[PDB]
């Protein structure tokens, strides 16, 4: 192993992946045009990041005080984080991160019932709650926890006639209400949940501009969903490239489309709540959602720039994420922990000591606990996830 690795990284070819994101971002081949959902950096054991060809997490286990440091080797036995790049080129399902307490309970749960981690039906692989950070790469539609109440009752107006769930919030329009107001739509069926659907289409055709236009657009892929209202109870985002959230627990939240990077834990907790063809558990859902509003003026995480160094503080030990600008001087780019690096525009070369190693977009390298710090030099950002302990 040099100083420096450079990855060798799992793409994922989910279905609603873009089939030409990759290749137009970074070059990343792809001659048979499948869809390329996710780009994998990090050491998850269902599909590794490599390097040279050998298994980082192998790797890692072989020395995880050298190559994590050695507050990570003793707060969590592995690598902290997954690394990825998402390319959301179908609108995806709205979710929900259950809770540190509500986590534990179903994780044992599932344990209680032998549900295999691998199983299609297990919701929990993790008795704790962490969050996520998404950065936008490409401009990055998004929804994000509740809307003000204010704002809900006024896009609510020209639909109040689709389902007496909705009239009875918008009579008294307060955290109680919206609760059942979700619960009922989600719990929508038959002729009830396609008067409501009517209701709301023939809404699409004069209300101009968004959500409206956010519905429709999730519309072609979901017509029959009882989540197409969520764009009328849940903040509809658009990031720039650059921008960046924190998704809490209990808070509904979906990736409508767009190329972004995700900081994320490897294993994590995941309740469905609209826009999937999959079954919900709804008294779960709603005993794992806060029915509170989030202002607009929150959505976005306020990162803090220091010297070339642009840092996104995030409330938790797990994983920290910064972006540095680079300079045809080098900069030193250090840290107590492993990190992963990841060219995000220009071009990167990183240099130990005699070795150099150059990165151009979309590429990768890993940099074990023990070989911190690394000069940086070239053109754009560099993107680092490592852990601040």
């Known amino acids: 192993m040099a100083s420096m690795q450079k990855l060798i990284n799992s793409v994922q070819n ?65 690598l902290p984080f997954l690394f990825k790049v998402l390319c959301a080129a179908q609108p995806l399902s709205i979710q929900v991160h259950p809770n540190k307490r509500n986590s534990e309970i179903g994780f044992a749960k599932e344990n209680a019932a032998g549900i295999p981690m691998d199983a299609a039906e297990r919701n929990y692989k993790d008795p704790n709650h962490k969050p996520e950070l998404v950065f936008a790469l490409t401009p990055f539609l998004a929804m994000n926890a509740f809307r003000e109440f204010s704002d809900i ?65 999730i519309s072609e892929y ?48 995941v309740l469905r709540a609209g826009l999937t063809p999959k079954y919900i558990d709804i008294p779960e859902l709603v005993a794992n959602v806060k029915f509170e509003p989030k202002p607009a003026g929150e959505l976005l ?46 071009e990167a070369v990183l240099r130990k000591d005699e070795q150099r190693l150059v990165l151009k977009p979309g590429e990768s390298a890993f940099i074990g606990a023990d070989e911190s710090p690394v000069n940086a030099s070239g053109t754009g950002r560099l993107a680092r996830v490592y852990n601040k302990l």
Request: with cysteine; glycine share 6%.
């Open 153 to 217: 009752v006024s896009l609510l107006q020209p639909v109040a006639g689709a389902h007496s769930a909705i009239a009875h919030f918008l009579q008294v329009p307060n955290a109680e209400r919206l609760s059942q107001l979700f619960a009922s739509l989600l719990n929508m069926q038959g002729e009830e949940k396609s008067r409501a659907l009517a209701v709301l289409k023939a809404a699409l055709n004069s209300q101009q501009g968004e959500p409206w236009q956010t519905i429709r657009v």
């Open 14 to 78: 989910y279905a609603w992946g873009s089939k030409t994101a990759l290749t137009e971002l970074y070059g990343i081949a792809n001659p048979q045009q499948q869809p390329m959902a996710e780009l994998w950096m990090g050491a998850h054991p269902k599909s590794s990041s490599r390097i040279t060809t050998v298994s980082l997490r192998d790797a890692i286990e072989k020395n995880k005080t050298a190559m994590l440091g050695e507050a990570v080797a003793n707060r969590f036995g592995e």
């Open 222 to 269: 979901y017509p029959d969903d009882s989540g197409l209202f969520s764009p009328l109870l849940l903040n509809v985002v658009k990031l720039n490239p650059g921008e960046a959230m924190f998704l809490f627990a209990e808070t509904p939240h979906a990736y409508l489309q767009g190329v972004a990077l995700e900081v994320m834990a490897n294993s994590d907790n």
């Open 301 to 346: 995480t306020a990162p803090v720039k220091s010297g070339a160094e642009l840092d996104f503080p995030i409330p938790v030990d797990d994983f920290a994420f910064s972006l540095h600008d680079l300079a045809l001087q080098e900069t030193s780019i250090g840290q107590h922990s492993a990190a992963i690096l990841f060219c995000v525009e220009g």
